[PDB]
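Thread: Modeling a multi-component assembly for a lab meeting

Hi all, long-time lurker, first post. My supervisor asked me to bring a structural picture of a complex we are working on to next week's group meeting, and I have zero experience with this. I have the sequence lines for every component (703 residues in total). Could someone generate the structure of the whole assembly? Inputs are pasted exactly as I received them:
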Amino acid sequence: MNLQEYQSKKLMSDNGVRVQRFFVADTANEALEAAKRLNAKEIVLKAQILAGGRGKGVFNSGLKGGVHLTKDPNVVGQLAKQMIGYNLATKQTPKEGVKVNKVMVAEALDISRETYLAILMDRSCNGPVLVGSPQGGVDIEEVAASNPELIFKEQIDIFEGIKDSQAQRMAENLGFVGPLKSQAADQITKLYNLFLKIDATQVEVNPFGETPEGQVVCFDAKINFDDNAEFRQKDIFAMDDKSENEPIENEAAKYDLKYIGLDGNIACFVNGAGLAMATCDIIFLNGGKPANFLDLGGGVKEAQVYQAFKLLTADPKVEAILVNIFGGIVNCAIIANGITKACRELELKVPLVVRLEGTNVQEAQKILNNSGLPITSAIDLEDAAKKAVASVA
Amino acid sequence: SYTASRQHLYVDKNTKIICQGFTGKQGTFHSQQALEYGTKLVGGTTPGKGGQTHLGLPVFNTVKEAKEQTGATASVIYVPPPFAAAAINEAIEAEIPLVVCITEGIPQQDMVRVKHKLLRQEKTRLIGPNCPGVINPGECKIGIMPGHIHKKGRIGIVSRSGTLTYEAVHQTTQVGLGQSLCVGIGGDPFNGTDFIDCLEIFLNDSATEGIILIGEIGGNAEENAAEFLKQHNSGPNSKPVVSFIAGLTAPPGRRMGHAGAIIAGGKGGAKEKISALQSAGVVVSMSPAQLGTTIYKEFEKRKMLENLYF
Ligand SMILES: CC(C)(COP(=O)(O)OP(=O)(O)OC[C@H]1O[C@@H](n2cnc3c(N)ncnc32)[C@H](O)[C@@H]1OP(=O)(O)O)[C@@H](O)C(=O)NCCC(=O)NCCS
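Re: Modeling a multi-component assembly
Sure thing. I ran the full set together rather than chain by chain. Output:
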């Protein structure tokens, strides 16, 4: 799930982390009043959408630029009128754009210095780790490739928690001095407890910096949430804007189906995450272009199979289907009947390759060929891949 | 260290099993199959149902009682995500030698806590969570894998994937090689057993003449296993290792079903895993449908070499 910028920074502000002051306008008038209410020497105005590169985007109203600067609250009003309601296209959105419903009206703070700081559950280390760099404002990866000596890491013991010495040391290594060291050490702490409270897999502050007046401020940040912990982050996951995902993915979600859209024309659905990724690869590997990854999960139902077929048969890109199911200890004849049932009810009109495996594959390969529907069976995963790739040209 | 408990992966015909979540939908079902398979399932736990009888077997309130009353040496967990990490802890505390956690969805922070206590002892070996368990064909089966596709034999299989393991199993059964011990380490990013853990057992076991390592995107365990093979499976009398690494077409930034299967910040891609594996002597099967024929051909290549030089 993804938070809007205003949702994620409010989350941080409420937990002691310092961010730019801001308000959230639903209307051009709201943006004007907010700009007035800021006691800000300079205002920034930012379209609230999930995609990146909002900076150089375009609006149906004609406005170039999703993010704008001005000292004049009136300017905020005008520019907001050219955002709110209209649609923002970026190098991360379909040519349609995204409807902009809210804009952030924030104070713009000058940056004197820039560091990188993230808290992260590190698989290599078996616990939470602080990762900082005195070199901020650039992507962390390029920093590690060019100057690994400027990556500093502190492992935090998850029961003992973050100790003052750990925060002092990281602050020091990122080049904060004097009263800025105290602010930075304080803020590293508050960031870390924020990261445990909300069950984050990563909290990334870049730039983690200083204002000229002497203030440590997280100027921007990205939060990654553990999907597993949703049952105990009810209030946060409720903030999720499902309206910017591929709508197929959202409908799949409604049926415990794990779907992810690829740019291809051969649709596939499989029980098992890893086998679903393998089926994507083995399709491409035989020339093809897979339309999607879909994981039915462990259990195959006459009814879940229907919803999967319902999705794929509703996607305009899809010109073929490769189903590959391991029946395990269920009679694969009772799967192929779920498949012929759903394919007749859905009026299957694209060619479907089905690989089954498990008990009674013999009577199962028969129901599939005897179906009177555009269905052909396959002996193994190379067959299905090869046959499916042939079905389009 | 915790590595001492690696031997407990090699479940066998004397393994005696209890089921945590025994009276639940999946505990019940896969217990019936454990009994169909001939596995020494001997009892189970459900808080608040100690005393009941289930599948002709006793139900206990705590792992500690179950261990005392039955002599159990291994535990399998079908406990729902909010409580499963607590179940794992109870079994570490109960000092159960081998614990298999089938549960998907345990919070990562939970598993960091579980791992914290796990790594600080050596009586208990954890496989999982989010895995299908371990099977010694014909001798002992802990988890959800279908028994009937297996056949006792010579290939060790370790794998982050459940359904992909079945492919490997079926293929190595189809080519006639059989499996010595399969271990599904599951698809979570924080878990109790990596590839290296299974390789040390495979390498030290004589029943295991070949290894298949099935991996996927995310983390660095494939890369670590590549290094390990360089130190422990070089020189002569080395065992062939065929691997398949899934997710070559996976888009970055996305969880590909498994919570642990995601490329982020450029780390965790499939092709980095193939290079690193291939640099240790590992034969990567391009196609997931060819694990069996590739490990098979690998044995042929060694036989052709012996015929050539005599
Ligand atoms: C763990 C999982 C299987 C449970 O599903 P389920 O069996 O349908 O669940 P149930 O609702 O029957 O609950 C199981 C039992 O756990 C019991 N339980 C709860 N806490 C427990 C504990 N600490 N110890 C023991 N039992 C416990 C419950 O009381 C329930 O028994 P009851 O219904 O008789 O009271 C499910 O959450 C899951 O992980 N799904 C499958 C994931 C998967 O495929 N992973 C494999 C990766 S290859």
